[PDB]
Amino acid sequence: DNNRIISRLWRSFRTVKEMAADRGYFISQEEMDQSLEEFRSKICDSMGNPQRKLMSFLANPTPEALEKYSDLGTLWVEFCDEPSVGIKTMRNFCLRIQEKNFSTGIFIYQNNITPSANKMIPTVSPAIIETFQESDLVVNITHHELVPKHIRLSDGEKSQLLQRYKLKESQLPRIQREDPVARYLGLKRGQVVKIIRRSETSGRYASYRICL
DNA sequence: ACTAGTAATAACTACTTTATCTTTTAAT
């Protein structure tokens, strides 16, 4: 069971690294191709107990992502040591985010999170905090065959689409904020994503969805 | 001293709602 837990944790860590890379943050090539043996050597102790605090890391946007998107800052990924998430731990994490001027931060829990923790999540302005479940991060959803590629559009691209189609913001097809693809991409309200899809009538098709 | 008008005598599926629960938090 310990080996299964370690393998699942390594898969979740790889999925988080891939998600950070897809968002435009720079991840080193050696870290992306980290093997299971290296992860167990540098994280697990002699008794095999995982070190959740050691997995927390920091990432910065690439210059290409910097010029493409002007709203990207520093990224901090933290893994909760304990299974449950009390209000005190969330307050401590929010204080750390405020004191370490992080633009965005990803918090990952094991079992569940208290509703009081979700009560105060809009009180972290200007920073943005996202909550993820580790068990939900075992398998990368974006690698599924049924899930096409989503690319977040810039403000200029969204504007150009709007004058090209003579549209309003509410007339576009809509994508929910709780959509797992939207949560993977960290979508915010009013942001449009372009989707390239296979089609049996024309080969390639392009769709656009605006976040709710 | 009699008569006739005359008026009153359904299951299937879904949503919504309620009370129950209880876990949560700060208070004993």
Short mmCIF file of all heavy atoms in Angstrom, two decimals, chain A residues 41-96:
data_model
loop_
_atom_site.label_atom_id
_atom_site.label_comp_id
_atom_site.label_asym_id
_atom_site.label_seq_id
_atom_site.Cartn_x
_atom_site.Cartn_y
_atom_site.Cartn_z
N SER A 41 13.43 9.00 -3.55
CA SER A 41 14.71 9.24 -2.89
C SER A 41 14.76 10.63 -2.26
O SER A 41 15.29 10.79 -1.16
CB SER A 41 15.85 9.06 -3.89
OG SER A 41 15.85 7.76 -4.44
N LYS A 42 14.22 11.64 -2.95
CA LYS A 42 14.34 13.00 -2.46
C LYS A 42 13.17 13.45 -1.59
O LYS A 42 13.25 14.52 -0.97
CB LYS A 42 14.48 13.99 -3.62
CG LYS A 42 13.25 14.11 -4.51
CD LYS A 42 13.50 15.07 -5.66
CE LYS A 42 13.63 16.51 -5.18
NZ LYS A 42 12.35 17.02 -4.62
N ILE A 43 12.09 12.67 -1.51
CA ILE A 43 10.90 13.04 -0.75
C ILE A 43 10.66 12.07 0.41
O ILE A 43 10.56 12.49 1.57
CB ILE A 43 9.66 13.14 -1.65
CG1 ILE A 43 9.83 14.29 -2.65
CG2 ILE A 43 8.40 13.35 -0.81
CD1 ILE A 43 10.03 15.64 -2.01
N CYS A 44 10.55 10.78 0.11
CA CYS A 44 10.27 9.80 1.14
C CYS A 44 11.47 9.61 2.06
O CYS A 44 12.63 9.70 1.63
CB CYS A 44 9.87 8.46 0.51
SG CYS A 44 8.32 8.52 -0.40
N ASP A 45 11.19 9.35 3.33
CA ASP A 45 12.22 9.16 4.33
C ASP A 45 12.58 7.68 4.42
O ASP A 45 12.21 6.87 3.57
CB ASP A 45 11.77 9.73 5.68
CG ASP A 45 10.37 9.26 6.06
OD1 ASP A 45 9.81 8.40 5.36
OD2 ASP A 45 9.84 9.77 7.07
N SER A 46 13.33 7.31 5.47
CA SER A 46 13.72 5.92 5.66
C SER A 46 12.50 5.03 5.91
O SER A 46 12.44 3.90 5.42
CB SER A 46 14.71 5.80 6.81
OG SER A 46 14.12 6.21 8.03
N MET A 47 11.53 5.53 6.67
CA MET A 47 10.33 4.77 6.98
C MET A 47 9.30 4.81 5.85
O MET A 47 8.26 4.15 5.97
CB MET A 47 9.69 5.28 8.27
CG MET A 47 10.70 5.64 9.35
SD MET A 47 10.01 5.49 11.01
CE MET A 47 8.86 6.86 11.04
N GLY A 48 9.55 5.56 4.79
CA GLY A 48 8.63 5.67 3.68
C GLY A 48 7.54 6.71 3.84
O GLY A 48 6.69 6.83 2.95
N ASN A 49 7.54 7.45 4.93
CA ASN A 49 6.53 8.48 5.14
C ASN A 49 6.77 9.64 4.18
O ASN A 49 7.88 10.20 4.16
CB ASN A 49 6.56 8.97 6.59
CG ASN A 49 5.47 9.98 6.89
OD1 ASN A 49 4.29 9.70 6.70
ND2 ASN A 49 5.87 11.16 7.36
N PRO A 50 5.79 10.03 3.38
CA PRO A 50 6.00 11.15 2.44
C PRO A 50 6.14 12.47 3.17
O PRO A 50 5.61 12.67 4.27
CB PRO A 50 4.74 11.12 1.57
CG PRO A 50 3.70 10.48 2.43
CD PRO A 50 4.43 9.47 3.28
N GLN A 51 6.86 13.39 2.54
CA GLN A 51 7.08 14.74 3.07
C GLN A 51 6.31 15.71 2.18
O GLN A 51 6.79 16.15 1.14
CB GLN A 51 8.57 15.07 3.11
CG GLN A 51 9.37 14.22 4.08
CD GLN A 51 8.61 13.93 5.36
OE1 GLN A 51 8.18 12.80 5.60
NE2 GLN A 51 8.44 14.95 6.19
N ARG A 52 5.09 16.05 2.62
CA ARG A 52 4.25 16.95 1.83
C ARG A 52 4.82 18.36 1.78
O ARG A 52 4.66 19.06 0.77
CB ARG A 52 2.83 16.97 2.40
CG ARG A 52 2.24 15.59 2.65
CD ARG A 52 2.21 14.77 1.37
NE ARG A 52 1.54 13.49 1.56
CZ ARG A 52 0.28 13.26 1.24
NH1 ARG A 52 -0.49 14.20 0.71
NH2 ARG A 52 -0.23 12.05 1.45
N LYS A 53 5.48 18.81 2.86
CA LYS A 53 6.03 20.16 2.88
C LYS A 53 7.17 20.32 1.89
O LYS A 53 7.37 21.41 1.35
CB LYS A 53 6.50 20.51 4.29
CG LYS A 53 6.64 22.00 4.55
CD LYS A 53 7.25 22.27 5.91
CE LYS A 53 6.43 21.62 7.02
NZ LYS A 53 5.29 22.48 7.44
N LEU A 54 7.93 19.25 1.63
CA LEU A 54 9.06 19.34 0.72
C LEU A 54 8.62 19.48 -0.74
O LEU A 54 9.40 19.97 -1.56
CB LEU A 54 9.96 18.12 0.88
CG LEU A 54 11.45 18.33 0.59
CD1 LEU A 54 12.00 19.45 1.46
CD2 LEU A 54 12.22 17.05 0.82
N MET A 55 7.41 19.05 -1.08
CA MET A 55 6.94 19.13 -2.46
C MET A 55 6.52 20.53 -2.86
O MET A 55 6.44 20.81 -4.06
CB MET A 55 5.77 18.17 -2.67
CG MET A 55 6.18 16.77 -3.10
SD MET A 55 4.75 15.70 -3.30
CE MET A 55 4.22 15.56 -1.60
N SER A 56 6.25 21.41 -1.90
CA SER A 56 5.87 22.78 -2.22
C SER A 56 7.00 23.48 -2.95
O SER A 56 8.17 23.39 -2.56
CB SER A 56 5.51 23.54 -0.94
OG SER A 56 4.59 22.80 -0.15
N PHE A 57 6.66 24.19 -4.02
CA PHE A 57 7.67 24.80 -4.87
C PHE A 57 7.12 26.09 -5.48
O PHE A 57 5.97 26.47 -5.25
CB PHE A 57 8.15 23.82 -5.95
CG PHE A 57 7.23 23.71 -7.13
CD1 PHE A 57 7.56 24.29 -8.34
CD2 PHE A 57 6.03 23.03 -7.03
CE1 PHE A 57 6.72 24.19 -9.43
CE2 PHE A 57 5.18 22.92 -8.12
CZ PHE A 57 5.53 23.50 -9.32
N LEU A 58 7.97 26.75 -6.27
CA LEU A 58 7.66 28.04 -6.86
C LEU A 58 7.98 28.00 -8.35
O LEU A 58 8.89 27.30 -8.79
CB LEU A 58 8.46 29.16 -6.16
CG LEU A 58 8.19 30.64 -6.47
CD1 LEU A 58 8.52 31.47 -5.25
CD2 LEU A 58 9.00 31.13 -7.66
N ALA A 59 7.21 28.76 -9.12
CA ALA A 59 7.39 28.84 -10.56
C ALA A 59 7.13 30.27 -11.02
O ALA A 59 6.38 31.02 -10.39
CB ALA A 59 6.46 27.87 -11.30
N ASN A 60 7.76 30.63 -12.14
CA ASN A 60 7.66 31.95 -12.73
C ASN A 60 7.28 31.83 -14.20
O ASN A 60 7.65 30.86 -14.86
CB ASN A 60 8.98 32.72 -12.59
CG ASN A 60 9.16 33.33 -11.22
OD1 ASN A 60 8.47 34.28 -10.86
ND2 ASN A 60 10.09 32.78 -10.45
N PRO A 61 6.55 32.81 -14.73
CA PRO A 61 6.12 32.72 -16.13
C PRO A 61 7.28 32.86 -17.11
O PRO A 61 8.27 33.55 -16.84
CB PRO A 61 5.13 33.88 -16.27
CG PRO A 61 5.55 34.86 -15.23
CD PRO A 61 6.06 34.03 -14.08
N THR A 62 7.13 32.19 -18.25
CA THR A 62 8.10 32.31 -19.32
C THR A 62 7.96 33.68 -20.00
O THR A 62 6.90 34.31 -19.93
CB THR A 62 7.90 31.20 -20.35
OG1 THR A 62 6.67 31.40 -21.04
CG2 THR A 62 7.87 29.85 -19.66
N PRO A 63 9.03 34.17 -20.64
CA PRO A 63 8.90 35.43 -21.39
C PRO A 63 7.85 35.39 -22.48
O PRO A 63 7.18 36.40 -22.73
CB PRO A 63 10.31 35.64 -21.96
CG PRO A 63 11.01 34.32 -21.83
CD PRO A 63 10.42 33.68 -20.62
N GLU A 64 7.68 34.24 -23.14
CA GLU A 64 6.61 34.11 -24.13
C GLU A 64 5.24 34.26 -23.48
O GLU A 64 4.37 34.94 -24.01
CB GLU A 64 6.72 32.76 -24.84
CG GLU A 64 7.95 32.61 -25.71
CD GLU A 64 9.15 32.10 -24.95
OE1 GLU A 64 9.00 31.76 -23.75
OE2 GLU A 64 10.25 32.02 -25.54
N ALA A 65 5.04 33.64 -22.32
CA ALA A 65 3.80 33.83 -21.58
C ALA A 65 3.69 35.24 -21.03
O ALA A 65 2.58 35.77 -20.89
CB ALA A 65 3.69 32.80 -20.46
N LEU A 66 4.83 35.86 -20.70
CA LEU A 66 4.81 37.24 -20.21
C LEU A 66 4.31 38.20 -21.29
O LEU A 66 3.51 39.10 -21.01
CB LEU A 66 6.20 37.65 -19.73
CG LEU A 66 6.52 37.38 -18.26
CD1 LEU A 66 8.02 37.26 -18.05
CD2 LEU A 66 5.94 38.48 -17.38
N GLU A 67 4.78 38.03 -22.52
CA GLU A 67 4.33 38.90 -23.60
C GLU A 67 2.93 38.52 -24.09
O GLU A 67 2.17 39.40 -24.51
CB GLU A 67 5.33 38.89 -24.76
CG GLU A 67 5.59 37.54 -25.38
CD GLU A 67 4.66 37.24 -26.54
OE1 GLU A 67 4.07 38.19 -27.10
OE2 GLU A 67 4.51 36.05 -26.90
N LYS A 68 2.58 37.24 -24.04
CA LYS A 68 1.24 36.82 -24.45
C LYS A 68 0.19 37.27 -23.45
O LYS A 68 -0.85 37.83 -23.83
CB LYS A 68 1.20 35.30 -24.63
CG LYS A 68 -0.12 34.77 -25.16
CD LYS A 68 -0.34 35.19 -26.60
CE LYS A 68 -1.67 34.67 -27.12
NZ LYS A 68 -1.68 33.19 -27.21
N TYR A 69 0.44 37.05 -22.16
CA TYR A 69 -0.48 37.43 -21.10
C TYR A 69 0.23 38.38 -20.14
O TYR A 69 1.30 38.05 -19.62
CB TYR A 69 -1.00 36.21 -20.34
CG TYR A 69 -1.56 35.12 -21.23
CD1 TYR A 69 -0.87 33.93 -21.41
CD2 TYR A 69 -2.77 35.28 -21.89
CE1 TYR A 69 -1.38 32.93 -22.22
CE2 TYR A 69 -3.28 34.29 -22.70
CZ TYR A 69 -2.58 33.11 -22.86
OH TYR A 69 -3.09 32.12 -23.66
N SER A 70 -0.38 39.54 -19.90
CA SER A 70 0.20 40.54 -19.02
C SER A 70 -0.29 40.44 -17.58
O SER A 70 0.08 41.28 -16.76
CB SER A 70 -0.09 41.95 -19.56
OG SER A 70 0.36 42.08 -20.90
N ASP A 71 -1.11 39.44 -17.27
CA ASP A 71 -1.68 39.28 -15.93
C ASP A 71 -1.08 38.09 -15.18
O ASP A 71 -1.69 37.60 -14.23
CB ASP A 71 -3.20 39.16 -16.02
CG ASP A 71 -3.66 37.84 -16.63
OD1 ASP A 71 -2.86 37.18 -17.33
OD2 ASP A 71 -4.83 37.46 -16.40
N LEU A 72 0.09 37.62 -15.59
CA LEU A 72 0.74 36.48 -14.96
C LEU A 72 1.81 36.97 -13.98
O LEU A 72 2.61 37.85 -14.31
CB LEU A 72 1.37 35.56 -16.00
CG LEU A 72 0.41 34.81 -16.92
CD1 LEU A 72 1.18 34.04 -17.98
CD2 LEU A 72 -0.47 33.87 -16.11
N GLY A 73 1.81 36.40 -12.78
CA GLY A 73 2.79 36.70 -11.76
C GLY A 73 3.47 35.43 -11.28
O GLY A 73 3.61 34.45 -12.01
N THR A 74 3.92 35.47 -10.03
CA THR A 74 4.57 34.32 -9.42
C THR A 74 3.54 33.26 -9.03
O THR A 74 2.39 33.57 -8.72
CB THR A 74 5.37 34.74 -8.19
OG1 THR A 74 4.48 35.33 -7.22
CG2 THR A 74 6.43 35.76 -8.57
N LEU A 75 3.98 32.00 -9.05
CA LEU A 75 3.13 30.87 -8.71
C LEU A 75 3.77 30.08 -7.58
O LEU A 75 4.96 29.78 -7.63
CB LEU A 75 2.90 29.97 -9.93
CG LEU A 75 2.34 28.57 -9.66
CD1 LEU A 75 0.85 28.62 -9.39
CD2 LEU A 75 2.65 27.64 -10.82
N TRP A 76 2.97 29.74 -6.57
CA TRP A 76 3.42 28.93 -5.45
C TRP A 76 2.49 27.75 -5.27
O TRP A 76 1.27 27.93 -5.17
CB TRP A 76 3.47 29.76 -4.16
CG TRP A 76 3.75 28.96 -2.93
CD1 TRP A 76 2.85 28.53 -2.01
CD2 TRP A 76 5.03 28.49 -2.48
NE1 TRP A 76 3.48 27.82 -1.02
CE2 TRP A 76 4.82 27.78 -1.29
CE3 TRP A 76 6.33 28.60 -2.98
CZ2 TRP A 76 5.86 27.18 -0.58
CZ3 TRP A 76 7.37 28.01 -2.28
CH2 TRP A 76 7.13 27.31 -1.09
N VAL A 77 3.05 26.54 -5.24
CA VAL A 77 2.28 25.32 -5.09
C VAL A 77 2.63 24.70 -3.74
O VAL A 77 3.80 24.42 -3.46
CB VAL A 77 2.55 24.33 -6.23
CG1 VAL A 77 1.80 23.03 -5.99
CG2 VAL A 77 2.14 24.95 -7.56
N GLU A 78 1.61 24.48 -2.91
CA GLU A 78 1.77 23.97 -1.56
C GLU A 78 0.93 22.72 -1.37
O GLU A 78 -0.22 22.66 -1.81
CB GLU A 78 1.36 25.03 -0.53
CG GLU A 78 1.46 24.59 0.92
CD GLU A 78 2.85 24.79 1.49
OE1 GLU A 78 3.54 25.74 1.07
OE2 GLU A 78 3.25 23.99 2.37
N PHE A 79 1.51 21.72 -0.71
CA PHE A 79 0.82 20.47 -0.39
C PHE A 79 0.55 20.42 1.11
O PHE A 79 1.48 20.60 1.91
CB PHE A 79 1.65 19.26 -0.82
CG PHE A 79 1.61 18.99 -2.29
CD1 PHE A 79 2.45 19.66 -3.16
CD2 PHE A 79 0.72 18.06 -2.81
CE1 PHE A 79 2.42 19.41 -4.52
CE2 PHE A 79 0.68 17.81 -4.17
CZ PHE A 79 1.53 18.48 -5.02
N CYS A 80 -0.70 20.18 1.48
CA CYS A 80 -1.07 20.14 2.89
C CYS A 80 -0.58 18.84 3.52
O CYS A 80 -0.79 17.75 2.98
CB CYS A 80 -2.58 20.27 3.04
SG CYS A 80 -3.15 20.40 4.75
N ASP A 81 0.07 18.96 4.68
CA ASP A 81 0.59 17.78 5.37
C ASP A 81 -0.53 16.93 5.94
O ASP A 81 -0.56 15.71 5.74
CB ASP A 81 1.56 18.21 6.48
CG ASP A 81 2.99 18.34 5.99
OD1 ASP A 81 3.57 17.32 5.57
OD2 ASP A 81 3.52 19.47 6.02
N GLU A 82 -1.47 17.55 6.64
CA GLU A 82 -2.56 16.82 7.26
C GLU A 82 -3.68 16.55 6.25
O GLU A 82 -3.84 17.31 5.29
CB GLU A 82 -3.10 17.59 8.46
CG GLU A 82 -3.59 18.98 8.13
CD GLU A 82 -4.23 19.67 9.32
OE1 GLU A 82 -4.19 19.10 10.43
OE2 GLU A 82 -4.76 20.78 9.15
N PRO A 83 -4.46 15.48 6.45
CA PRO A 83 -5.54 15.17 5.50
C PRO A 83 -6.64 16.22 5.47
O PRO A 83 -7.01 16.70 4.39
CB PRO A 83 -6.06 13.82 6.00
CG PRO A 83 -5.64 13.74 7.43
CD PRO A 83 -4.32 14.44 7.48
N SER A 84 -7.19 16.57 6.63
CA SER A 84 -8.23 17.58 6.70
C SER A 84 -7.61 18.97 6.59
O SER A 84 -6.40 19.16 6.70
CB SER A 84 -9.03 17.44 7.99
OG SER A 84 -8.23 17.72 9.12
N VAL A 85 -8.47 19.97 6.36
CA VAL A 85 -8.04 21.36 6.21
C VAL A 85 -8.92 22.20 7.13
O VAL A 85 -10.08 22.48 6.81
CB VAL A 85 -8.13 21.85 4.76
CG1 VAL A 85 -7.78 23.32 4.69
CG2 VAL A 85 -7.20 21.04 3.88
N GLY A 86 -8.36 22.61 8.27
CA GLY A 86 -9.07 23.50 9.16
C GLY A 86 -8.97 24.95 8.73
O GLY A 86 -8.24 25.31 7.80
N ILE A 87 -9.72 25.81 9.43
CA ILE A 87 -9.71 27.23 9.11
C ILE A 87 -8.37 27.86 9.48
O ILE A 87 -7.91 28.79 8.81
CB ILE A 87 -10.90 27.94 9.79
CG1 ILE A 87 -11.03 29.38 9.29
CG2 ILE A 87 -10.77 27.89 11.31
CD1 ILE A 87 -11.10 29.50 7.78
N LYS A 88 -7.72 27.37 10.54
CA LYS A 88 -6.45 27.94 10.98
C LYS A 88 -5.36 27.74 9.92
O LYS A 88 -4.57 28.65 9.66
CB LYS A 88 -6.03 27.32 12.31
CG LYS A 88 -4.72 27.86 12.86
CD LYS A 88 -4.11 26.90 13.87
CE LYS A 88 -3.79 25.56 13.25
NZ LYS A 88 -3.10 25.70 11.94
N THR A 89 -5.31 26.55 9.32
CA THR A 89 -4.31 26.29 8.28
C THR A 89 -4.54 27.18 7.06
O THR A 89 -3.58 27.68 6.47
CB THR A 89 -4.34 24.82 7.89
OG1 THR A 89 -5.63 24.49 7.35
CG2 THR A 89 -4.06 23.94 9.09
N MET A 90 -5.80 27.38 6.68
CA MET A 90 -6.09 28.26 5.55
C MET A 90 -5.73 29.71 5.87
O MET A 90 -5.22 30.43 5.01
CB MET A 90 -7.56 28.15 5.15
CG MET A 90 -7.85 26.94 4.29
SD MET A 90 -7.54 27.24 2.54
CE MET A 90 -8.23 28.88 2.35
N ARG A 91 -5.99 30.15 7.11
CA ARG A 91 -5.58 31.50 7.50
C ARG A 91 -4.06 31.64 7.45
O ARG A 91 -3.54 32.67 7.00
CB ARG A 91 -6.10 31.83 8.90
CG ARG A 91 -7.61 31.99 8.97
CD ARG A 91 -8.14 31.69 10.36
NE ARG A 91 -9.42 32.34 10.62
CZ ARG A 91 -10.16 32.13 11.70
NH1 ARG A 91 -9.78 31.30 12.65
NH2 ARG A 91 -11.32 32.78 11.82
N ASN A 92 -3.33 30.62 7.91
CA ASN A 92 -1.88 30.66 7.85
C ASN A 92 -1.39 30.71 6.40
O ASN A 92 -0.46 31.47 6.08
CB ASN A 92 -1.29 29.44 8.56
CG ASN A 92 -1.48 29.50 10.06
OD1 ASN A 92 -1.32 30.55 10.68
ND2 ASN A 92 -1.84 28.36 10.66
N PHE A 93 -2.00 29.92 5.52
CA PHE A 93 -1.61 29.93 4.11
C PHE A 93 -1.90 31.28 3.47
O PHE A 93 -1.10 31.79 2.68
CB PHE A 93 -2.33 28.81 3.36
CG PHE A 93 -1.87 28.65 1.94
CD1 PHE A 93 -0.54 28.42 1.65
CD2 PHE A 93 -2.78 28.72 0.89
CE1 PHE A 93 -0.12 28.27 0.34
CE2 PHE A 93 -2.36 28.57 -0.42
CZ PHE A 93 -1.03 28.34 -0.69
N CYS A 94 -3.05 31.88 3.80
CA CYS A 94 -3.38 33.19 3.26
C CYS A 94 -2.41 34.26 3.76
O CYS A 94 -2.00 35.14 2.99
CB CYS A 94 -4.82 33.56 3.63
SG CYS A 94 -6.08 32.54 2.84
N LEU A 95 -2.03 34.19 5.03
CA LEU A 95 -1.05 35.12 5.57
C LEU A 95 0.30 34.96 4.87
O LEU A 95 0.97 35.95 4.56
CB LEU A 95 -0.91 34.94 7.08
CG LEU A 95 -2.05 35.48 7.93
CD1 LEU A 95 -1.85 35.11 9.39
CD2 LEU A 95 -2.17 36.99 7.77
N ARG A 96 0.71 33.71 4.63
CA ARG A 96 1.96 33.47 3.91
C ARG A 96 1.89 34.02 2.49
O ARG A 96 2.86 34.60 2.00
CB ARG A 96 2.27 31.97 3.89
CG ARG A 96 3.74 31.65 3.69
CD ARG A 96 4.10 30.31 4.30
NE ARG A 96 3.22 29.24 3.83
CZ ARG A 96 2.49 28.47 4.62
NH1 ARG A 96 2.50 28.62 5.93
NH2 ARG A 96 1.73 27.52 4.08
#
